[PDB]
Symmetry: C3
Subunit: 564 residues, 3 copies
Amino acid sequence: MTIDSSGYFRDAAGARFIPVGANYWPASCGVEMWQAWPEDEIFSDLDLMASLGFNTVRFFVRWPDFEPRPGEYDATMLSRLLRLLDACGERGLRPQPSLFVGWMSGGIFWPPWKSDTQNLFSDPVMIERGAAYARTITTHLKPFATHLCGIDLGNELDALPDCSAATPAQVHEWCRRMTGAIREVLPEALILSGCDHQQVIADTGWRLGGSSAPRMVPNPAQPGIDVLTMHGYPVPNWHPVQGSGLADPLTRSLLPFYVKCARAFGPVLLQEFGTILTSRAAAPHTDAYLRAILPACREAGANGYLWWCFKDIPAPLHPYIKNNFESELGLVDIEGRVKKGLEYFVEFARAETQRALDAPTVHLYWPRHYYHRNNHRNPGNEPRETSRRLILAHHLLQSAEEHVGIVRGDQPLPSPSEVERIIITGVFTGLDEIKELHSWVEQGGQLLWHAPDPVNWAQAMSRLVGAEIADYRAATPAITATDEGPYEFTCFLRGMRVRIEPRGAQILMTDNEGSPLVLRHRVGAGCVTSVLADVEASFLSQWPDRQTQEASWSAWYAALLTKD
Amino acid sequence: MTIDSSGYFRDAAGARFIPVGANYWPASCGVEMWQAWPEDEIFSDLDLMASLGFNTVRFFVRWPDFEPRPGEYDATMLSRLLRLLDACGERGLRPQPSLFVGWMSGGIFWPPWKSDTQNLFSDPVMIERGAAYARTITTHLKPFATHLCGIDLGNELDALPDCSAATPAQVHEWCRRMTGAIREVLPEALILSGCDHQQVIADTGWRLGGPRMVPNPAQPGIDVLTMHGYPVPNWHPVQGSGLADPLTRSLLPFYVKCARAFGPVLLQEFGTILTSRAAAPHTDAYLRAILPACREAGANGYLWWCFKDIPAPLHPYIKNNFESELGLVDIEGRVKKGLEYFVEFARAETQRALAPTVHLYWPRHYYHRNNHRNPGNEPRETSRRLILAHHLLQSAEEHVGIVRGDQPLPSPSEVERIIITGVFTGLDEIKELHSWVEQGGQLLWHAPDPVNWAQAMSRLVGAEIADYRAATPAITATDEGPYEFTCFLRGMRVRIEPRGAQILMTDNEGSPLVLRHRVGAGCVTSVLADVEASFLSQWPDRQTQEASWSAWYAALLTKD
Amino acid sequence: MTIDSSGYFRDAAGARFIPVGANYWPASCGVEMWQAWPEDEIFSDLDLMASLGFNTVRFFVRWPDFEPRPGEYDATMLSRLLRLLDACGERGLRPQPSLFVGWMSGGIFWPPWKSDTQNLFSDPVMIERGAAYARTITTHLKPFATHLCGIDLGNELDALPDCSAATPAQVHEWCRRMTGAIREVLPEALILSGCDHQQVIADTGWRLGGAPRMVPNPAQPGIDVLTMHGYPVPNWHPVQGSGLADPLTRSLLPFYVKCARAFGPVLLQEFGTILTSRAAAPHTDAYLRAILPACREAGANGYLWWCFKDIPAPLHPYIKNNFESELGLVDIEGRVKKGLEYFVEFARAETQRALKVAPTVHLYWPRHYYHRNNHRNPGNEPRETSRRLILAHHLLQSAEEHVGIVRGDQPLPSPSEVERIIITGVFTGLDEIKELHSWVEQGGQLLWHAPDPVNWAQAMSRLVGAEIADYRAATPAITATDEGPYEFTCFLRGMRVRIEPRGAQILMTDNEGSPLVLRHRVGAGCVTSVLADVEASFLSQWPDRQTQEASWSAWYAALLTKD
């Protein structure tokens, strides 16, 4: 099992395959599966999966179950593991076993010999016990090595409180150690991270973006990980921009946007996706939601699709008691029937696996230094702040009917024949980034620069924007108008506003009190359009008036975008 | 002493005893009393307390005075304690001595061998010296065991910063050790926590709601719960307006009701803070409201803070000089004008020692720190909503109680009507609520929670979620006027489709806002907005809005 | 050298000396100077400084270059350090070396054997390694003792993350120890802290206001000369000004200097315009002509610009904070940039004035200014306090007052020297209230914005002239002076009290009747008390500054009293 050059899974025989299926816990016992072991129920569920066309099943090796005392592995659980691996094989399902679990449905399930004082990532004993546990489980997977769908490091390790208390360096080291332990048994295994969208919207230490001989791996900030993962749900307050739900185009753009970011750093599996609401009343809306997000996730480059989760789980036990929405996430009801509203996933999965037998018209700028914790070279970017601006720009550009890509500022910029238009959404850019943006613009790039950064505004930025800072001025709102309507910007980058003097640039727009607000500067073959306001922040500050303002928000980008 | 079946003190004679009196430091020296020891002034203050009809005095054994070096107790201080205890008995006053002090009047006073890096609850050495210090003092109290009004563990231990750095489990264990230590000497002593209202409005590890049988197992070895309360606007999570404000006046009875649901409650500290002659018409009216209300909430005793004005020009009265003017009596030994009703009240309660129409819902999981079964409730958030609803309902002439969700719901004969004020409820609570509604209960459910909205919640509310919707304001009207709700639970709104429930009110865009659902013999009225948080968000407009706020509950409340 | 009784440097001959010059890194390499050592370029930059009339240059001994391994001091660096000191004396420039660097231009540069888990101030190994580093470099300085312009302890030690993790007592002891180490080698050296305006606007442990060797500010033991740094950048201050042209922005640096001056001698060790482009030239010129005399009037004893050269070196930290690349005084061809020539002129005038050898209102600096581990502090915190001080200071200057600072941790000067005091809603303990009572009785004129209810007992009642009858809803208070309406939305600690007079007169009421401003004669003086948080209310109206600011100045003028 291997990942091909276009980021797709390949089986031992070198044919491509698209993982499709479900994350799994039995209905009757949820997370207690290893203890309750309702084997007829499990095998009947695997039969149901196979009959729907699924070719993979993600399941969780719950660590306390398997190592109840330090170094003593439960032989009954290991035998149940082997029975499961066997039963999936005979039914055409490639198991995707998840080791470090850990985080699950609102609970946290660790071995009793780990105290809350022992940080999963940094504690010396936990590192050793974790490595031995990874090697032990991998040993028991080795007889199935060619029938796996990768080995999942753990479930949403970036959601753990332990991420706040361990340094990024320590998380990086733990990941190296746990992948290395797996490779002491299966050196060629495909390992997935198991992380969710907090890779994009927070700094948990689980990062997209390093610079690389340990192993050839696409994302060196996650050493030893062959396949990046993305998880995503429509719940409005699980994201830094609050959408309105299943019918909202903003909400629908979130998961494809996350996949697009991940895809820029390596192959990406949509390892978890769900509607959360799955009742009969929700059926018209969940159906339309799925018909939007799944093809968009495909176009964004996902290499596989696993629903959360297979069955409703009426088990009256932790953590389904305190977060009872977790009890009704099944693709399938009690009778083994696909729930009204969700059938499209079945149709899409069958389409995708028969498939396995263009272009973006604008790119959002991902800054060279994205994560802030212990980053001494970062000019001030923070994931939650950057990602709020990227999410909204991404959605509003798609409402202007643009095809939106991501371009990486920590890599040389693609020549303007590949990436022709770049939008910087008020993120902070260092000297090297400016120089490269200059050379890119010189060969013909069209740059739309929202709120260039005064902290990095010296000679280099002045020659690129085409203007010098004459003085600061009060950060009071700027009111203006394009040819389609009026605009008011209340936010400015770092809370500061500047008075500029043109030094090559033309004044494309002024505020209503006469001063320059949008500049336009031609530099070699390209053209820099700079806006002296924090556009995305201003729009986000007027979120309660979203209904009536959104059309003009999106019309803003269209008016200012130029073409060679 | 002993605590009877109804939560009141009993003396050796088996008579009911209602403690009435004051917390005490001397005027001339304040917290330095054990060092300065003005014995004549002290004994004369004890005289005046007795002449006023008091039967209890609360005073503080200040640990640094008694244990200036580890394991070395200061015999001079112990002599002084004996003289004090003797002087109280000779004068008719039951001493309530408070051990771990500690926290006092804006200062913190620990022995000099307790480093700032040594947490009081979790440090191994501190725990052992604490147990040893508690035993030692209880040894010197034993000669008076039949004359104490209980032993007070310490003053407002829940207010210490150490509460923040120690886990709830470590606080629980410290409480078990120290009460266990006292009981090695006086196994039958009545022990009191000494805690204030932060038991309700914060998670300090001093908790209402979970060996020798105690009423409140979260405080192991404690016999009598305590409550402290002052009208200061910004000492509470809802800003009242002071002595004349019915909201501020409802705060202390509210806290007492909450504590009373978990066990017997002494009103161990209450005061007006403002005691000047200019304040006198207002202190008089405030005390006339809260003392009867606290009685009806179930307080079993009343101790004023504090007995004398304290002009002592020393720490901590220099930096918080309002502490210098909390006396019940001036320096001429006269009860301050405006405070006299407390003497009248106390006399009345010791002479006599010879209702709900709706209940507020206290969630099963109240405290968040290291609580893995908690669906999201935090004391400050929950108490905010509870304080406001309690006050609004009392303005609607309702007599409000508290029903505990961590215990089986009483039948609708006892508790007929329940309001859930936008708190988070697990599956087990929903199932128990549904069973209680089945038997006739009337449920007013403000903001049923999407995170626990699956099948059980849908059958009880009588609707399923069709989708989320924008969390924009909901405007509506009852038959008495308009309403606007800007706050929703977890900052999310849902679109519902009915499945058995009627639509009672819509927002002015047509979509359902309030539902009403007959379930068995009872009825669930559900509001799809965070009602209490919305009102609280309109706090600047309280004066013009408060009337409709309490009208809201009156409009929606169901009776059989 | 020595500091005289007025607060000014004096050379060995006993003649007054005003440091004027620049902070320096070479343009080609920036902070890598010790490693790159472009000596020809360095020595000609020193020529340039002397030709401009400067007498002092401030440079930074970067620790990791001078001790790459514990206990082993690089000898090439020590020889380069020596050649640099030679070049300064050979050109009339007094070197001011900075030892603990450390913090520079948005980067942090420590030796590699210091891990990030080792706090500079509290880690025992770092403490002892630091003292040895101090003593070692001081030893290479003492050949030049009579030619230094003091020794600078470090650069903005108070900006370090370590300040948050080390207690104030730990920072205090570290400074005791490091100054002690310098004095082992040069017992009479002039030592400077190297701190900036965070001394005033935060609690970093680097504080104003505390047998040891007598120093002017005991909170910083062993420090002979306090330092101040100041830049116009709007969001580097707790009150957001509008830039080079904003009187508020221009008042900040003098305000910080006046505060530090109330505790000891102050060197304007860093100042700059940040914006130095030719487009900025009209505004830098005007900003410099304002702040430089005003800092002289505030008591600064020297002036060092940041920094001498533009630095295009494409290396850390110029890459992430590229504004740091264009702070030079002179351009690439070596001429003073347009808009900045006034500093050279002001420097030459200060040289001359030194060759030949007014406060109408005082702002109340509370007895307990810093909050960390201060058990006697009634609740003052530097950022809150300085926000109100800065605003009041600027507004009073706009009403054409000359504004001083009076220290509440010292006996109050008699009304002959300090006649009028303004308390800008800060928290006052009992001992401070009695001292204010005695001062007013002697004739003091007190304007008391927001007397603190937490300290409102009998002493405050007697001084204010009123008692608290009750709290009241903290809704806004609307009133009118003879010159316009006012609305106050902010009240101290978010609480509002209903008062009852007891000797005071009701000077002003709110538009619903209740007292708002009181006046109370006490002995020969007079207390005017406002029952609203004046400076916070004005700060809450910052978006409307442009239309509102004049009425804010007029508020102070209306209420200020005389005999």
